[PDB]
Amino acid sequence: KVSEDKNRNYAVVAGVVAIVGSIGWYLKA
Amino acid sequence: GTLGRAFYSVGFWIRETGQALDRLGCRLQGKNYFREQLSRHRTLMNVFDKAPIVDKEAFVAPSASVIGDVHIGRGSSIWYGCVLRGDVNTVSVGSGTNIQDNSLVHVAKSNLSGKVHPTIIGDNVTIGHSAVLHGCTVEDETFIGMGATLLDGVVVEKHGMVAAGALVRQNTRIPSGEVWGGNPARFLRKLTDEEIAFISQSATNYSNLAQAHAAENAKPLNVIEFEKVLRKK
Amino acid sequence: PISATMVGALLGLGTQMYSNALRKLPYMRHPWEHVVGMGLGAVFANQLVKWDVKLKEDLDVMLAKARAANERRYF
Amino acid sequence: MGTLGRAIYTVGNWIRGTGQALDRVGSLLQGSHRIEEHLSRHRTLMNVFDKSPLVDKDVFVAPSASVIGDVQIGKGSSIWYGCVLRGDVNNISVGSGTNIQDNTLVHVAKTNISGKVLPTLIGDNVTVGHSAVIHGCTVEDDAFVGMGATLLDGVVVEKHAMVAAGSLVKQNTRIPSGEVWGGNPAKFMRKLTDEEIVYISQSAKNYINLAQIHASENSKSFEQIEVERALRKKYARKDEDYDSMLGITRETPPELILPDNVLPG
Numbered sequence: 001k002v003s004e005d006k007n008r009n010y011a012v013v014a015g016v017v018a019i020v021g022s023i024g025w026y027l028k029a
Numbered sequence: 030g031t032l033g034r035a036f037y038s039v040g041f042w043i044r045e046t047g048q049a050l051d052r053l054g055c056r057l058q059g060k061n062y063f064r065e066q067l068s069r070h071r072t073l074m075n076v077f078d079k080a081p082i083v084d085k086e087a088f089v090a091p092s093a094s095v096i097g098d099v100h101i102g103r104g105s106s107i108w109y110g111c112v113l114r115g116d117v118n119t120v121s122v123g124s125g126t127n128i129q130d131n132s133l134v135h136v137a138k139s140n141l142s143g144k145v146h147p148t149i150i151g152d153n154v155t156i157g158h159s160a161v162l163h164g165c166t167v168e169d170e171t172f173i174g175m176g177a178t179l180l181d182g183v184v185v186e187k188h189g190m191v192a193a194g195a196l197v198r199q200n201t202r203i204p205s206g207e208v209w210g211g212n213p214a215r216f217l218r219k220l221t222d223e224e225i226a227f228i229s230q231s232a233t234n235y236s237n238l239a240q241a242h243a244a245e246n247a248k249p250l251n252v253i254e255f256e257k258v259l260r261k262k
Numbered sequence: 263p264i265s266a267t268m269v270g271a272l273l274g275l276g277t278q279m280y281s282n283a284l285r286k287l288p289y290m291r292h293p294w295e296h297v298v299g300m301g302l303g304a305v306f307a308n309q310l311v312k313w314d315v316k317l318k319e320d321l322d323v324m325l326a327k328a329r330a331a332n333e334r335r336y337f
Numbered sequence: 338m339g340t341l342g343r344a345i346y347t348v349g350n351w352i353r354g355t356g357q358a359l360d361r362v363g364s365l366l367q368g369s370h371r372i373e374e375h376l377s378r379h380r381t382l383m384n385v386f387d388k389s390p391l392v393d394k395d396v397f398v399a400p401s402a403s404v405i406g407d408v409q410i411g412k413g414s415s416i417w418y419g420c421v422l423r424g425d426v427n428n429i430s431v432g433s434g435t436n437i438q439d440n441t442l443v444h445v446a447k448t449n450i451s452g453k454v455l456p457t458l459i460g461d462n463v464t465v466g467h468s469a470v471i472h473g474c475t476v477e478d479d480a481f482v483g484m485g486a487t488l489l490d491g492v493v494v495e496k497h498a499m500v501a502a503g504s505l506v507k508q509n510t511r512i513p514s515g516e517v518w519g520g521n522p523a524k525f526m527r528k529l530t531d532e533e534i535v536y537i538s539q540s541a542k543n544y545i546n547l548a549q550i551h552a553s554e555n556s557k558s559f560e561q562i563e564v565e566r567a568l569r570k571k572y573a574r575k576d577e578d579y580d581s582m583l584g585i586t587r588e589t590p591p592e593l594i595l596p597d598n599v600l601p602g
């Protein structure tokens with residue numbers, strides 16, 4: 001029901017932020 | 030042909046991508062069961078379009094290996110540990126024929142030593158335990174002894190018997206009603222009518238024993254053993 | 263015709279398959295990586311052509327300065 | 338855990354759904370030709386004709402072995418990889434401390450052509466070599482059957498008798514004690530020395546030790562398999578120099594150490 005590894009969740013969020021930031025960086029440059 | 034092989038290859042690219050995606054989805058949920066070493070053995074395995082065609086009445090043991098273009102007729106049986114490889118040419122097994130445990134029925138892997146001969150097994154044929162048939166033909170109602178080796182081009186005529194442990198050299202034609210044995214196989218004696226009766230009665234009995242074995246293997250997999258293996262500590 | 267994007271995508275595809283072959287793996291072992299490599303090759307080729315144009319533009323100005331300094335000697 | 342954990346769980350569910358849909362689409366493009374791999378239906382121990390194999394507690398049966406029907410296996414015995422002990426039409430008995438090596442077939446006969454049809458009897462501390470064929474015969478205690486040998490119905494191998502590798506022993510042949518037979522057909526070769534009797538006994542005793550490590554490995558669960566895979570990776574190499582700089586000594590965990598009775602020394 002829930003993923004419990006909090007470090008893994010933080011890393012997943014960091015990877016998502018990296019991807020979305022790269023997309024926005026390209027789109028606004 | 031070439032188009033089918035290209036489509037088969039491109040399908041593997043899409044499948045490998047999908048399976049990797051599924052693994053990513055499990056890793057996000059903290060599941061690692063995809064890492065379990067489970068047996069990839071297939072009783073019936075295809076080599077691209079070459080797939081085994083097996084009669085609905087023919088018993089095949091789950092641990093047997095049937096690879097490529099392999100035809101099994103009605104009432105026939107493939108017992109435990111048997112290997113049948115039909116890639117470079119076809120393997121055909123007639124009706125009412127028993128291939129006993131740990132037998133190997135295969136064709137040549139390469140055409141370096143000549144054109145690759147197929148393997149033909151007739152009807153009501155008995156192949157004894159751990160026999161090796163390589164690119165030969167076996168006619169209807171013949172007896173191949175346990176541990177015998179038949180090389181390529183060998184013809185075993187109807188009602189002919191290869192003794193146990195006999196090495197039949199390449200292109201050796203066994204005439205009807207003859208017992209051949211030894212290394213290399215040579216004529217030993219003439220077959221008797223009682224032996225012919227025992228051959229037929231044995232193949233009929235093996236078809237009935239195979240029916241029994243095909244029923245007990247069909248039993249639903251025990252969930253108790255599954256739970257016992259899951260909960261080991 | 264033959265553009266920087268096409269050449270770069272082909273070179274990215276070639277690199278991934280060359281990398282797979284150097285490791286004795288099948289050519290199309292991880293096809294999403296082939297897609298990534300084609301994208302990266304196209305990006306790199308377009309950037310390289312743009313950078314070459316900029317470099318030539320800068321070199322022209324610097325050679326102008328060099329020639330002016332050298333022509334100062336004959337005054 | 339929490340809201341973020343649930344969100345990532347739902348996203349992973351979507352990702353798995355997409356992955357399986359892509360797998361199906363690829364399978365369709367393959368032309369439905371590839372036969373799918375399935376859950377294993379091999380039964381190591383199987384009943385037939387309401388007969389159940391009777392296997393002692395400390396017997397190594399390889400998972401790939403097929404023990405079928407009315408088969409009895411005694412203490413300390415070992416059934417190796419690919420072995421088929423089909424006791425369906427008659428009884429198969431295996432004594433204590435007896436090894437049946439890889440890819441062996443043991444079968445019986447309901448009725449032989451002539452004489453009295455008997456079950457397959459294998460005694461104690463008997464070695465049966467790789468890929469042997471044992472059909473309706475009797476092997477008494479402390480006997481040796483070489484690899485690739487074929488024993489037909491009615492064959493009797495006596496105590497301290499040896500069948501050489503590759504031998505075809507004809508029906509109703511008797512191998513006397515202290516003798517080694519061989520060939521196709523098998524025939525008397527020579528007498529067995531005392532060192533060879535010692536060899537036979539040491540063979541059975543070595544295989545009881547080998548059976549233990551194989552039985553231990555084959556019965557490990559998924560979790561233990563993964564733990565030991567990680568351990569094996571962690572201890573595959575060493576940097577004892579940096580350990581000495583750190584002032585530590587790395588020791589091999591006990592789960593990775595084999596018992597002394599199986600080591601060459």
Ligand SMILES: [Zn+2]
Pocket residue numbers: 158444445446472
């Ligand atoms: Zn049999």
